[PDB]
Amino acid sequence: TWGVSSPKNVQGLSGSCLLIPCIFSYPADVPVSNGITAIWYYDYSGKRQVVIHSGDPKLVDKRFRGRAELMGNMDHKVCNLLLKDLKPEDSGTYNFRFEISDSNRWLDVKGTTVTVTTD
Ligand SMILES: CCC(=O)N[C@H]1[C@H]([C@H](O)[C@H](O)CO)O[C@@](OCc2ccccc2)(C(=O)O)C[C@@H]1O
């Protein structure tokens, strides 16, 4: 069954780090020969910036370069996103997408809202 489970809200402090827990799923009969591509988006419906791209890392916006890293193992169906050196501007929406093959790709429209404060 196709899906992405991650928190609706997550809070963090400026200069610290934060973890957005995440897990995904898909049907048992979906073939997976050459792994799964993992992608995280920031403000998808607006600026649409790439935070993580396990398939084409040069697509990662300079804004997040060196500051975001995917924790979980795709093999274990985990998509946890760790964000480092937080900035108030990091506040906004984050959505995960995984792409296996052909039409077997999925963007979670729910996403997680991030709130970074100074103190
Ligand atoms: C078999 C699983 C599945 O339904 N995957 C579809 C996904 C999926 O429905 C969404 O990602 C779930 O949120 O949508 C897609 O188009 C997205 C699209 C739809 C309409 C217009 C433009 C683009 C997508 O690539 O995200 C096409 C996929 O085939």
Swiss-Prot record:
Reported induction: By interferon-alpha.
Sequence positions that bind N-acetylneuraminate: 44, 97, 103-107
Coiled-coil region list: none
Domain Ig-like V-type: 1-117
Expression across tissues: Detected in lymph node in the subcapsular sinus, interfollicular regions, and T and B-cell boundary (at protein level). Expressed by macrophages in various tissues. Highest expression in spleen and lymph node with lower amounts in lung, liver, bone marrow, heart and skin. No expression in thymus, kidney, brain or small intestine.
Phenotype when changing residue 97 to L: 10-fold loss in affinity to sialic acid
Effects seen without this gene: SIGLEC1-deficient mice are viable, display no gross developmental abnormalities, and exhibit only subtle changes in B- and T-cell populations. However, they are significantly more susceptible to bacterial infection than WT. In addition, serum IgM and IgG amounts are greatly reduced in mutant mice.
Disulfide cross-links: 22-79
Function: Macrophage-restricted adhesion molecule that mediates sialic-acid dependent binding to lymphocytes, including granulocytes, monocytes, natural killer cells, B-cells and CD8 T-cells. Plays a crucial role in limiting bacterial dissemination by engaging sialylated bacteria to promote effective phagocytosis and antigen presentation for the adaptive immune response. Mediates the uptake of various enveloped viruses via sialic acid recognition and subsequently induces the formation of intracellular compartments filled with virions (VCCs).
Record text on subunit structure and interactions: Interacts with CLEC10A.
Annotated family: Belongs to the immunoglobulin superfamily. SIGLEC (sialic acid binding Ig-like lectin) family.
Protein name per its UniProtKB record: Sialoadhesin
Annotated organism of origin: Mus musculus
Shown chain mapped onto the complete sequence: 20 to 138 of 1695
